[PDB]
Amino acid sequence: GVGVSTGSFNNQTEFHYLGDGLVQITAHASRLVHLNMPEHESYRRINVLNSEAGVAGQMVQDDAHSQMVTPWSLVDANAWGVWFNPGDWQLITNNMTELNLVSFEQEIFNVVLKTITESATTPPTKIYNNDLTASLMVALDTNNTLPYTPAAPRSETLGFYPWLPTKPTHYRYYMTCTRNLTPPTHTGQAGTITNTISAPTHSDVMFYTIENAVPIHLLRTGDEFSTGTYYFDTKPLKMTHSWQTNRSLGLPPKLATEPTTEGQQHTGTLKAATDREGIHQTINNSYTEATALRPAQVGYNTPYMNFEYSDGGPFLTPIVPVYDTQYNADEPNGAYRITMGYQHGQITTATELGRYTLNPISKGGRAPNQEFNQSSPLQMENTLNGTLLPTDPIGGKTDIHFTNTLNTYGPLTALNNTPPIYPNGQIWDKELDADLKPRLHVTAPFVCKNNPPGQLFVKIAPNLTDDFNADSPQQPRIITYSNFWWKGTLTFTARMRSSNMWNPIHQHTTTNDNIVNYMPSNIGGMRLYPEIPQLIPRKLY
Amino acid sequence: GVGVSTGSFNNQTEFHYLGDGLVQITAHASRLVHLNMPEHESYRRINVLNSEAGVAGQMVQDDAHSQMVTPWSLVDANAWGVWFNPGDWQLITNNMTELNLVSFEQEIFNVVLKTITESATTPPTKIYNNDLTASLMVALDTNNTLPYTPAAPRSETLGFYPWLPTKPTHYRYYMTCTRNLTPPTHTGQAGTITNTISAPTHSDVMFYTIENAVPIHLLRTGDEFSTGTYYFDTKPLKMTHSWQTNRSLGLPPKLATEPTTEGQQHTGTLKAATDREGIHQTINNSYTEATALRPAQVGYNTPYMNFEYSDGGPFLTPIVPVYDTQYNADEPNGAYRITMGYQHGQITTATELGRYTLNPISKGGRAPNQEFNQSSPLQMENTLNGTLLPTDPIGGKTDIHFTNTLNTYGPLTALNNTPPIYPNGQIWDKELDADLKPRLHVTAPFVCKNNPPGQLFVKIAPNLTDDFNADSPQQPRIITYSNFWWKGTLTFTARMRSSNMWNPIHQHTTTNDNIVNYMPSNIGGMRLYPEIPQLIPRKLY
Amino acid sequence: ARMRSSNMWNPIHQHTTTNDNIVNYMPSNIGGMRLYPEIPQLIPRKLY
Q: Which of A280, A488, B504, C41 gives A29 a disulfide partner, CB atoms 3.0 to 4.6 angstroms apart?
């Protein structure tokens, strides 16, 4: 029967406080998902090029790839703000040390299929007849047979507002590209560079169609498509950021001259350099605090802005994101620059899209203009030619320092994970099916070792015109759309924090200049400006 | 299935006479509730100001606040005339001493969703296509997570007629306002007053959205949304008004000169003033009847027309409503001035809205031009400067008397509750969640100590146009409406009255000039002019 | 005590720690401590 409802809209985030501190954050989400029909039902391998990199010097501007455009649309839950309004994400940045991840279920219910029909009067008048008999095709890829494409790094998820109706995005995935871009040049001189994408190699062209991979449930207007409860197996995230560094690990040296006056303008003085004792990593006698004996370095000098070049094309090496120094650099420390849409933040007036250059606040980051390197003997009051200051060029290039090439990722390199980004970051991510797994993902903090949860493919079934369908490239169809609700349930599990100290830590407050970032205006303009995550401090040693 | 009915229209008020006098007034109500679609689905915080108070002297005319307009519409039962036609409320003002309150259930059934469609011919012609697949969102706030806003003090309830189809009103609630209106001035002089609403403070901005608070049941055209039977826990109201005053409490003094003639023009004479005896509250020897020994005062001199001023703004102190003196004053006694709509009373011709300045008839009220105050010694034939007559100004203001400032609410102040007002008054009310609860509410006579019954939020689900819904402030929609029935059941419990006296008391009759207030005219014009409540007298001591 | 539950959208005022507030929470070079007050009752609630 059509006139019977099939599901319940639900969006409350139940913080069900279990014993011993553990909580069970059951986060629901429900949005009307307005699906339009596919503009073409034929699968298309669209090679993409650009004339922008074909002129010399614009080789960062490299948009060329080979794209497999499918008519199927993807309903995506893999974004943080779908499940958490800022009132409930304030509760977790204030109070939770760890976040485990447990359950996940999707549900499409209460689909409304409609036929639009044009009448030929003096305005364009469109009549919305109701389809009682048409269907739409859903496909829960319960094995992840298809390439897992999360829409969070493109900000193409469902919109993070409950009342605003969202849109699902077209499923598409990378096909093999064999990129020719060399020679790599400067900007000033002209070169005979070749900017073509070549023919795809035979051994790797990987064409997944949706019909021959996942079984597809047709759904009439009284449907209820229930995904089974996916149980995660992830590492427990740690929301508590670490502040200790290699000038803060271990036991500090004792001081003989201790201050007498109030105010921190006066400083206590240690013992002499050659008179101190302990274990030490160099040859020289004087034990300063810079060259000390620290267990492992936190962070690592990434060779930054380093454009590697693989069969796919030129690409920048992703840096583990970490809190910058007191000098805001953010490029060798891996800043996030997340541009949203008008479903994801961004007060809906006539301006362009908001930006928010972000960082975490886990203090483990370095500065490129603050580092230096020396010769093998230590030699305080060092020789001009024995120490490599960052004023020195590399190969005669004055803007380029040693740290552009210098990598220090040794085995003893402790490192914090990716911060979860709000509301625009990604929640979970597919484990890279490689022989050597990466230790952490920069795209998402939760890593699924098992089969990741099924991405959901939704497409309108072809409602066909009376016209013939043999020996024709493109058929006519009845123009149509859909309005199906979508209910999720993402059950977290988190441990409450315990204050084991004296001074009160930084909590996510609400200032007088902050309520305008949290309240609607006279029009209805909403905004979801980010939250700098990982507020509770913790010790790394 | 759509073509099967789901509920029963029902409106009979069963007076089920139980034993020992108790009755169980089971009052049903059922009205067609015509819901229109929301004009916008975006939440809007609309600050309200007015230029009327910005000029000096109009500072009672203070309409400025900060309003949170939500697209959800509220179906309200909290009004008396929904449940009681005047034939059944005559039965309870004639015969019932107390009214307990027991049960309450709501039910939305038999919804009819329709699409309106415009055709472009020479008149505007509108075609009502039927939606078999669309839905409407209902939300029974079973915990009162949202701010409880009763529509009875704004006369925005369902209309009190069974056959006339009603309308639900848009749910909206007060946001924080920080009002600047000083200096408070007179009317004659001009001042440099500042009339602005300021920026809302950070610590208190309280933005409840409907989706993230209460789980929401989508309902197709064959729905039946049944609220569970809410069981009240209220004080038993007492419909019997009290007439005894401090010139009527206790034992009267005995008289020696008793009258001889027929007719009350001749009066019995008491003993002398200095010769009477008894307990007495002053120092002087003469025991008059004014200064007597009475257990507690009934009523209390409110400082009336007293505009207190809180973070919200200027507001008048609500006075406990009580029967005025023989001199009709009604302002220091808290009159009701209830203006209705054409669904709530008010013969539906071309006139403006009816008024009915009302009072209860519980005799405990005072008059401001009939009171006076004296010095500490009593001193009959009092000194000109020793007694404060209400001809005396306060601070040189001749119209303002001592009683404008004078409060006499002592601990021994007996007081009657709020009269229930018909048909326009409120039935129940939320307990003010404060540390010190108020003793009585002026808005409604029944007080719910527990969680109050769930207010019901109804909104049409978004029926969307083919046009895109990303990166757009305002989307187009199919214009639509709804016709859902709404059945309630408000089970009272009341005790029958017992006449323990000789003379017959005032019952609510029907005079020859009263049937026009109770009967329809040749057009169909109905009216629900009020009933002066609480007719049975009782003793207070 | 009962834990609070956030039943709303916008985040309420919590007792934070600003850059001009750590000097009210940390000892100095002498040993000077301080317990400047906290403005209490931060979570808002409705009275009706």
A: A488
